A paper describes a structure:
[name] is a 94 kDa outer membrane protein, essential for the intimate attachment of bacterial cells to the host cell surface, followed by actin pedestal formation. [name] is classified as an inverse autotransporter, a subclass of the type 5 secretion system that transports the C-terminal extracellular region or passenger through the lumen of the N-terminal β-barrel located in the outer membrane. The [name] passenger forms a rod-like extension consisting of four tandem bacterial immunoglobulin-like (Big) domains (subdomains D00–D0–D1–D2) capped by a C-terminal C-type lectin-like domain (D3). Here, we describe the crystal structures of the combined [name] domains D00–D0 and D0–D1 from the EPEC strain E2348/69 determined at 1.5 Å and 1.8 Å resolution, respectively.
By contrast, the crystal structure of D0–D1 exhibits a kink between the two subdomains, leading to an approximately 45° angle between the two and a distance between the N- and C-termini of only 36 Å. Here, we show that D0 and D1 exhibit a seven-stranded strand-switched type (s-type) fold. Additionally, [name] D0 is structurally highly similar to D1 with a root mean square deviation (RMSD) of 0.68 Å and 0.84 Å with invasin subdomain D1 while sharing little structural conservation with the [name] subdomain D00 (RMSD: 4.68 Å). EOM analysis of D0–D1 revealed the presence of two conformational states, a bent and an elongated conformation. The bent conformation fits the kinked crystal structure of D0–D1. The equilibrium is shifted towards the bent form in comparison to the extended one with a volume fraction of 0.8:0.2. Based on this definition, the crystal structures of D00–D0 and D0–D1 have θ ~ 170° and θ ~ 60°, respectively. Figure 4a shows that D00–D0 adopts extended conformations characterized by a narrow, approximately bell-shaped distribution of θ centered around 140° whereas D0–D1 is considerably more flexible and explores a wider range of domain-domain angles, including the strongly bent conformations. The best crystals of D0–D1 were obtained in 0.1 M tris, pH 8.5; 0.2 M magnesium chloride hexahydrate and 25% polyethylene glycol 3350 (PEG3350). The flexibility demonstrated by the D0–D1 and D1–D2 connectors is also likely to be functionally important.
Author numbering: 555 to 752
Amino acid sequence: VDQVGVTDFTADKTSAKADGTEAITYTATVKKNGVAQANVPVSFNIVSGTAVLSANSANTNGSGKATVTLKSDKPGQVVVSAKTAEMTSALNANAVIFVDQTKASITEIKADKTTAVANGQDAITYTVKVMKGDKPVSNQEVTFTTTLGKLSNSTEKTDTNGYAKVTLTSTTPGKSLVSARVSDVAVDVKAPEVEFFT
Ligand SMILES: [Cl-]
Ligand SMILES: [Cl-]
Ligand SMILES: [Mg+2]
Ligand SMILES: [Mg+2]
Ligand SMILES: [Mg+2]
């Protein structure tokens, strides 16, 4: 309240080719008390992963929006953050993935919510997509693991649209990190962290 801050930091794509050429474009929105803030410097940082940012700091335009692009030559996951001076900590965007287009690779992992009740019933749903040649791959085995709770299954085969899904419940509270992988791709794909509460 009464502080300029990044309220949203999103990308136009969940994945791109690991050719160092295709760009993922991020948009940071900056508001104070819900009102767009113009001419505010937004600092961008690669929190984790291997990639290159086009800029490290850009000012918002007259709509309160500042953009930056990301490219990479390495298959993997990348987390980029955005911050304004008054924020205590940067806002992380959802991870994105750079893929070898010639190989069936996970291109996204999404959780339908980031919190749930720790009663063994309230389930968080994770959805992974697998693609090759920018097309979805069917019947690819995606294997899931977790640091907390019970997954509905360990391995699910992608459907005709490239998607595999599992649910996660927990009878005890805490943060949970779900990971996913496919064969022959050397990327430990991490889902957004979630948290269960009693
Ligand atoms: Cl996402
Ligand atoms: Cl459990
Ligand atoms: Mg989509
Ligand atoms: Mg693309
Ligand atoms: Mg439910």
